Amino acid sequence: LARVAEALGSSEQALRLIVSILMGYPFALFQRYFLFQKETYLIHLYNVFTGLSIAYFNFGMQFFHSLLCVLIQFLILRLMGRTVTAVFTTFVFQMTYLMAGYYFTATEHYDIKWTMPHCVLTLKLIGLAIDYYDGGKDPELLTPEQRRFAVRGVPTLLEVSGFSYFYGAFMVGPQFSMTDYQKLAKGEMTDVPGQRPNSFVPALKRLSLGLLFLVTYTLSSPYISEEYLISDDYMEKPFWFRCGYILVWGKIILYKYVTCWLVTEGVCILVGLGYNGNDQNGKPVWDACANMKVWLYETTPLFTGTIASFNINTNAWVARYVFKRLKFLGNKLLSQALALFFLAIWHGLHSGYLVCFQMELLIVIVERQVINLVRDSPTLSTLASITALQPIFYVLQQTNHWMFMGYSLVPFCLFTWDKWMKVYKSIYFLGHVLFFTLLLVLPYIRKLL
Amino acid sequence: LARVAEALGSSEQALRLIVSILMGYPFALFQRYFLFQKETYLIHLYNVFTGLSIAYFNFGMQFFHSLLCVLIQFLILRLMGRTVTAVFTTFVFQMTYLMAGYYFTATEHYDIKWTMPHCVLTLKLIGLAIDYYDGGKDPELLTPEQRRFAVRGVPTLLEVSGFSYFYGAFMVGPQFSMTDYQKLAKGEMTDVPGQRPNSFVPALKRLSLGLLFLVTYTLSSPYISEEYLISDDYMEKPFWFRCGYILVWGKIILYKYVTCWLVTEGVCILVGLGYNGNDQNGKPVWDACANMKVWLYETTPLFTGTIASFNINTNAWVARYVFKRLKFLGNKLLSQALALFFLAIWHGLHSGYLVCFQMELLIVIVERQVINLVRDSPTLSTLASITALQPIFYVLQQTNHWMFMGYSLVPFCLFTWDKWMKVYKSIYFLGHVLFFTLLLVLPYIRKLL
Ligand SMILES: CCCCC/C=C\C/C=C\C/C=C\C/C=C\CCCC(=O)SCCNC(=O)CCNC(=O)[C@H](O)C(C)(C)COP(=O)(O)OP(=O)(O)OC[C@H]1O[C@@H](n2cnc3c(N)ncnc32)[C@H](O)[C@@H]1OP(=O)(O)O
Ligand SMILES: CCCCC/C=C\C/C=C\C/C=C\C/C=C\CCCC(=O)SCCNC(=O)CCNC(=O)[C@H](O)C(C)(C)COP(=O)(O)OP(=O)(O)OC[C@H]1O[C@@H](n2cnc3c(N)ncnc32)[C@H](O)[C@@H]1OP(=O)(O)O
Ligand SMILES: CCCCCCCC/C=C\CCCCCCCC(=O)OC[C@H](COP(=O)(O)OCC[N+](C)(C)C)OC(=O)CCCCCCC/C=C/CCCCCCCC
Ligand SMILES: CCCCCCCC/C=C\CCCCCCCC(=O)OC[C@H](COP(=O)(O)OCC[N+](C)(C)C)OC(=O)CCCCCCC/C=C/CCCCCCCC
């Protein structure tokens, strides 16, 4: 039992998480094979039982926390449903519950535990509360992309339990809305585009690609190391070696996430929740619940071309439920700073997340300024119009996006001020000084030309 | 020097604070004797010099913190003066500066230091920012008590420095607005009600009363003790003795504040800032800058009769700049809870202030419910109309307000969860259980009759 559990250099918790994630396929197959049920309560109870069983298997003494959390949530949502006080009360309650969880947890390296499922659950649930409050407004246009996306005040006595504890998107899965779940519940998501289809092209391809990334990461894992950053053995002697190591790093840690999300996607594609219609050619498209892009993620030089292709669901949720809801402050920068601060507090332990997200804001602002300036000058346009040879558009432009990505990703994997600063000072604070110089130089030359 | 500094059981810091507070009278006399100055910059420079000298005398390495704080404040107020972003930015900046100060300070017992002057300064300065933002609105009625109280957008290049560093109300003094300070600056506060008047009846009486309370407190100080609560020597054996001790306590700690505020009042009465007009009889009244009431403070049985007579200035400021500015949430209880939470965060170290203010909210709600129910019943009105003898209105009603006052004041002087809980459990959590029972009983009997 335990002899082979930790045999291949794996802890007791990572293997448990990976087997729990992989165990979603048989449940989806069982549900799809038995679809002749015409009563929704059976599906709801099945989802609740499967979610609770998975939570028990992962850790058997902490699921009652999330159970009482969702219980209190719909208990308080039943009363004062449309009141503006309700949304603020549920926001404060959920945020303080998560913050107390982090404060009393005090994890050190990763320590896979209840925190991730509770975090996903609470963000999805705050989204549900916002949607319910908005759905009680007047039926007019109101940014017409909302009526298809907002609940119509229907009773939610039991659907909230099954919606919260979905077996597919429980650990790190997507964060779909409420209306699509209700459409799935009583069997009208696909009349005949996807009853039998597909389970052949999309799901198998996604599973195979996830397995490919997983084997690549586990083959490249022992060769590289993370604690070598702290260690001083033949590291502080050369300079360019440190930059090259950080460049090679950062592009390898991210894969740790990638595989995971991809395999979760497969489960959804098997259920049918990913359907959103068909294109002009008439072929149905399933790229609606996707969390990553196949190709654009790793073949984009622009800084802003990654935040739109790394994780679609969380970024889209933040854009939808912060920017569109905080337009009464007359400054876009303040709204962006508030959104990034909220995203930092979402999973921020001590200091690494704050500095990482501040740095990210700095890159996005600098990139927007630079891209605005180019192709907007009487003289620089001709220089940029040189298209016979493009050395700048070549590898010269790249191998700098990855370097700053690793530079801003270092505080993410080391969130203690001592280790953070000790490993971050040896690179001479290159990114901050370089971007401060650039940010103070561009306005003057822009005014010059 | 130091032989007599600590001779009478006094630390090096309390004596410094008391001598600094008392040293305000000679400066006021010097200013009043030389009033023929027709230029405001001389008065402003005099106020700044006196305030900086007092700050240097109290502690000589930390005043630059407040100097840079006020500098940054009016630097950021110069730009985007009327923008809604400015008020939120200054609010966040001041609050986070004070919170960082408390977090990096980590005081234990009282440890008189920079924190109190910085706290008073930052609250006054946030008030100034709110006033400046409001003054840029339309000139209509707008709760007509505001035009006399709001600035009219006049330049504030130098008046902010003299206003912030007033020598009178610097440590624990009052928190007067901006317009009255400007009226005082160029000499039109009193044309001839108070050029020579008075400095005889008001100031001397206030000083004498403050000295009387001070000598009473210092005579009753060594007889009683505070650490006896922690000590178990012949304390945990009897029960009624603990309640009697807490009753006698609480009424003695408050005097520690009282004297202080009173003596500060004297300084203001000498300057002339306390004038607000005259009554119907024509005699001028100086009870405008007062921070305590002479008689109503200690001769009121009602719970709500103390929050309107303990400290007028801070309570009035909180009522003016929170309730009147947070009416867009449709629930009074939420506004009250937010105000009390802000007042707790104002000077809250770890836990005692939060529980103290929550308890205070509970008493005020319970008292309002009880006073609403009485004299509002078909049958209980006759019982309450018995006026031949009033044992209830006698000492029976009192000796219970003081007891709950001490019960809710215990966590204020012991703000560490260990000592707090250890001294608070021995009284069997009497207040919380009694008021929970009363709060759950009154609605049913109210519906009954
Ligand atoms: C290379 C760049 C980044 C490099 C990475 C650096 C650090 C990396 C940090 C973490 C990476 C490491 C591990 C990540 C993996 C797992 C950890 C979880 C963390 C994440 O996985 S997270 C990754 C980044 N995480 C973000 O979070 C960044 C993006 N997050 C945003 O939020 C963005 O900002 C975005 C792109 C969504 C918005 O970008 P945008 O600015 O282009 O949006 P846009 O302007 O196009 O929209 C126009 C609409 O603004 C509204 N509008 C106008 N004026 C307004 C005003 N005055 N006030 C308010 N609203 C206003 C109008 O209503 C209009 O609406 P309409 O369309 O109808 O006109
Ligand atoms: C015995 C009771 C307390 C016992 C003490 C227990 C614990 C003691 C705690 C500390 C004591 C120890 C040491 C203290 C010494 C130094 C430490 C510093 C701490 C202090 O030194 S601190 C002491 C207490 N510290 C407080 O802080 C309590 C009071 N602090 C408040 O804030 C109160 O609450 C108050 C009385 C000021 C307000 O009392 P209130 O409720 O009677 O006011 P009211 O109703 O009369 O005003 C009607 C107006 O509400 C507005 N309005 C209506 N509906 C609304 C809605 N839906 N939303 C928003 N606004 C609405 C309308 O606009 C209307 O305006 P209009 O007049 O035009 O009609
Ligand atoms: C614009 C912001 C300016 C930043 C403000 C700077 C605050 C730091 C200032 C003064 C602290 C002096 C402390 C007095 C003593 C307290 C000790 C303490 O407790 O402190 C510890 C350290 C000092 O070491 P030690 O004396 O104990 O050495 C002892 C030897 N040994 C190394 C073996 C441990 O103090 C430190 O250095 C603290 C190092 C950093 C800690 C906080 C992280 C800063 C966060 C930056 C991100 C802000 C972005 C916000 C906006 C986000 C938008 C998305
Ligand atoms: C409605 C609110 C419900 C309250 C939530 C309760 C949270 C407490 C819960 C669970 C904590 C279990 C902890 C697991 C271990 C972590 C240790 C820790 O770090 O914790 C320490 C203590 C436990 O002692 P130990 O194991 O270390 O003993 C060791 C032996 N020895 C005594 C020598 C030190 O944990 C404690 O007991 C904590 C005691 C209290 C600390 C926070 C104070 C509560 C605040 C209440 C006011 C809320 C009002 C808000 C609204 C304001 C409106 C104006």
Numbering used by the authors:
A (entry chain A), B (entry chain B): 42 to 490
Sentences from the paper on this structure:
The re-acylation is catalyzed by lysophosphatidylcholine acyltransferase (LPCAT) and among the four LPCAT members in human, the LPCAT3 preferentially introduces polyunsaturated acyl onto the sn-2 position of lysophosphatidylcholine, thereby modulating the membrane fluidity and membrane protein functions therein. Combining the x-ray crystallography and the cryo-electron microscopy, we determined the structures of LPCAT3 in apo-, acyl donor-bound, and acyl receptor-bound states. A reaction chamber was revealed in the LPCAT3 structure where the lysophosphatidylcholine and arachidonoyl-CoA were positioned in two tunnels connected near to the catalytic center. The structural and functional analysis provides the basis for the re-acylation of lysophosphatidylcholine and the substrate preference during the reactions.
After solubilization with LMNG, the oligomeric LPCAT3 was further separated from its monomers by size-exclusion chromatography in glyco-diosgenin (GDN) supplemented with 0.2 mM arachidonoyl CoA. The 3D refinement using C2 symmetry generated an EM density map with an overall resolution of 3.49 Å and a resolution of about 3 Å at the core region of cLPCAT3 protomers. The cytoplasmic end of the vertical tunnel is lined with positively charged amino acids and thereby provides a docking surface for the coenzyme A moiety, where the binding of CoA is stabilized by the electrostatic interactions among the pyrophosphate section of CoA and basic residues R409, as well as K365, 368, and 373. The araCoA extends into the T-shape chamber and turns at the joint point near H388 to a “side pocket” with its double-bonds in the acyl chain, and the carbonyl oxygen of the arachidonoyl pointing to the conserved residue N352, implying its role as protonation reagent in the hydrolysis of thioester bond. When N352 was mutated, the cLPCAT3 show an impaired acyltransferase activity, confirming its critical role in the reaction. To hold the acyl chain, the side pocket is in general lined with hydrophobic residues, e.g., F344, I348, I404, M446, and L450, and the functional assay showed that the mutations on those sites could reduce the enzymatic activities to various degrees. Unexpectedly, the E401A mutation fully abolished the acyltransferase activity, implying the importance of E401 in maintaining the binding of the acyl-CoA molecule. The cryo-EM map analysis on cLPCAT3/araCoA revealed the non-protein electron density sandwiched by cLPCAT3 protomers and two 1,2-dioleoyl-sn-glycero-3-phosphocholine (DOPC) molecules were well modeled into the large blobs of electron density. This non-contact dimerization might be mediated by those intermediary lipid molecules and the relatively harsh detergents used in the crystallization trial deprived the cLPCAT3 of the lipids bound, resulting in the monomeric biological unit in cLPCAT3 crystals.
